Amino acid sequence: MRIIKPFAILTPQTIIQDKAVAFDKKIEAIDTVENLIKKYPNAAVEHDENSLLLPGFANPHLHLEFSANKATLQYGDFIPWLYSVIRHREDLLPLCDGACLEQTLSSIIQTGTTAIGAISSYGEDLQACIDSALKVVYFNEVIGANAATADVMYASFLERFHQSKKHENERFKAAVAIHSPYSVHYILAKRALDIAKKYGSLVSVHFMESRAEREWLDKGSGEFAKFFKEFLNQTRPVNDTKSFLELFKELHTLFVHMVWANEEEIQTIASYNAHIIHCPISNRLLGNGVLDLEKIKSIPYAIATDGLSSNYSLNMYEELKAALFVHPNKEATTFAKELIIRATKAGYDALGFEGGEIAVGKDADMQLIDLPEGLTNVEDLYLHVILHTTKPKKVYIQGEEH
Amino acid sequence: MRIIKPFAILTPQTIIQDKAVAFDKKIEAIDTVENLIKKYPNAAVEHDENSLLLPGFANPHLHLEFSANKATLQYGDFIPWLYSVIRHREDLLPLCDGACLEQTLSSIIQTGTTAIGAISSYGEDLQACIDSALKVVYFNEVIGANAATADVMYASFLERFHQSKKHENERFKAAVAIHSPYSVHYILAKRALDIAKKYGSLVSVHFMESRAEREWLDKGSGEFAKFFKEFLNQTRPVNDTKSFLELFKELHTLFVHMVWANEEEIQTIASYNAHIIHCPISNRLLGNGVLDLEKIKSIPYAIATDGLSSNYSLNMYEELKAALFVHPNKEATTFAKELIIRATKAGYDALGFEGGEIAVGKDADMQLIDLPEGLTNVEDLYLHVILHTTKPKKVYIQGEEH
Numbered sequence A, B: 001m002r003i004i005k006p007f008a009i010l011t012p013q014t015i016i017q018d019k020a021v022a023f024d025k026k027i028e029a030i031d032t033v034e035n036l037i038k039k040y041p042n043a044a045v046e047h048d049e050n051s052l053l054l055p056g057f058a059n060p061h062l063h064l065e066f067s068a069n070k071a072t073l074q075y076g077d078f079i080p081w082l083y084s085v086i087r088h089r090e091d092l093l094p095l096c097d098g099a100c101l102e103q104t105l106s107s108i109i110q111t112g113t114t115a116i117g118a119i120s121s122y123g124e125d126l127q128a129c130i131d132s133a134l135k136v137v138y139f140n141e142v143i144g145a146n147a148a149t150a151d152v153m154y155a156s157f158l159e160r161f162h163q164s165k166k167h168e169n170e171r172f173k174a175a176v177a178i179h180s181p182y183s184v185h186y187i188l189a190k191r192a193l194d195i196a197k198k199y200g201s202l203v204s205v206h207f208m209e210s211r212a213e214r215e216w217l218d219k220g221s222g223e224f225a226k227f228f229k230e231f232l233n234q235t236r237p238v239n240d241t242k243s244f245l246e247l248f249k250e251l252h253t254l255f256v257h258m259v260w261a262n263e264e265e266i267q268t269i270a271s272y273n274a275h276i277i278h279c280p281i282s283n284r285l286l287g288n289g290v291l292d293l294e295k296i297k298s299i300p301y302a303i304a305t306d307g308l309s310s311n312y313s314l315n316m317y318e319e320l321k322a323a324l325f326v327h328p329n330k331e332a333t334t335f336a337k338e339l340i341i342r343a344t345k346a347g348y349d350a351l352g353f354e355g356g357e358i359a360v361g362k363d364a365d366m367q368l369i370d371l372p373e374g375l376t377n378v379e380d381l382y383l384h385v386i387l388h389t390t391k392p393k394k395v396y397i398q399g400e401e402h
Ligand SMILES: [Fe+2]
Pocket: A061, A063, A119, A206, A256, A306, A307
């Protein structure tokens, strides 16, 4: 058992001062040191009077296999990005070898993230993910818009799913991802989702990431038409949007991006066991705009970084700074608090892990960070944490310091 | 004489490959190494084939005296920020002692800035500024909304101006700043601007930073009314906006912030020898919104950071990232190019120094930075410079490496 007394605790929902945290694997008590040592005389006390304790972040959406990308893929516009992925992935993917994967995951921890949602298209990231101390939801992604080759795509997905499933434990979950409504034909999607139903697996889907997707699904026109004509020899979207969305009705689903989702889709998703995953940097850099947080207010959201295929870092502090800036008309002190909650508790909820909150009974998944100096107004703490922090002093996963 | 051969030169307006730069104090030639050594057999050649050369940044607006602020001033809303400045400045200002000023200026250079516009309200930053290797326009700021005490405010301004003027040389210019149209009564402003006229000094003014200012000047109402009533015992704005703006007609002026400027003001300023100074982080953090770059397209703009009184860093790379994000609907590859030009050449133009461009005859004020790896499309270089760079490998001011 250990006790840490910081300047303040961000729970994340509240700011607690004049209390410490007793923990082992889980958070056991939150009280004054005076009271804690009565209960835990065996716990050494660390006084960190110029530090803050907050939960470890969740990052519920990242494409680890693309972690060698720096400037190879094309930014600025979604369809050119997708062409660039198709062009470069055969070389880019193997460039992220075991050492690259291992280092990338270690750096996630070092920047204060303690739980991730890994989107895996090819499965060669499995060993690195099971080796990591992180909590991981390992989403086995399926893709395939041609009904005639669904069998091959399904068989690969199924094999990857079962390869991951043997490694399940309290910190590692095997899951299912559907690439998108434009790239996964209905029947193949349903087959993959039936595996999720059978096992109670979490599900992720990219939904309405781009305006091109919006127009293609709605009208069978727009910039995606040339892409489907050239790349897939298809003249029309293979899916009816509403029918596709209904496939997710009985599952726990992460709807990623969601920038271009419409009011009807939002009402439907609000009725589901669903979370939106907001990836502000990726959306802005790919010419996809900015998710409107009023429009989606009926559905809980969490923050993620996406992969290094459409981001310059996997550091949640960088993501949170960008989030402040792409929602520039949200008053900063209150929005910073919202952001910290949505990067910790909300993402843990999306991933289904017992953490993201400094509360009794939660796993001791925590960050110890420096207190911004000269703080006048304690309610400004959330904002100053985002602005001034880039690396925690200590990061704990189930009480173990990394 | 020296020669550097990088992967590419950002001039900033163009990307040049397969050429090197010969320089001493000034850039002397841009040509292949083969051609340069014929002209400059005395110049050693540095091959930096995994680097880029670009101009040093200009940062035409910074309040150096507030460089001890981290979390003391109140963010989120302009008038509460101003109250916090009034409350805390007596203690905050002396906290930035000589060592703080010296370190702050050194860090500006280390982050790739080679020229600044320093706004000085009290003059205790003069020694540090003259000591720095930076190019500095040292703006002596005047403030005072009470016509009855204009003499005292004017005398202090005049003394500070002349104290700075004795230090003028090719890299250090004495200049004049008018705090704002709400805080400097017309007659005092005109007296200070007459000094600028006499000496041909550059001028800076904060103009339409906040909506409160807009409403106060336009209608004599809004959130500034309580402030003027309580703090100054004034019931009405002391200035007519148009009359105040006309004071700047015959001067070279930097109009800072400009978020809330109206169409009439923009047309007037476009007819003046004037630049807008865009401070995206400061404006967003103080609840002032975002400058609309279409609205002001008729007036050249440059990027600045403001002081650490309303920013978390003085690093232009951080400012440029934030600029990408607060203008999220500007296509990223082209906007990044615009930003790099507006942080180098445009800011040098605003400050009146011969730099900000890698061109023959300009001062050799340059940055050598790492080339982002794996670059497929060279036109993406500007974007990847912003995303992946935080500290140059070398920074030159008039050819001297720092
Ligand atoms: Fe993704």
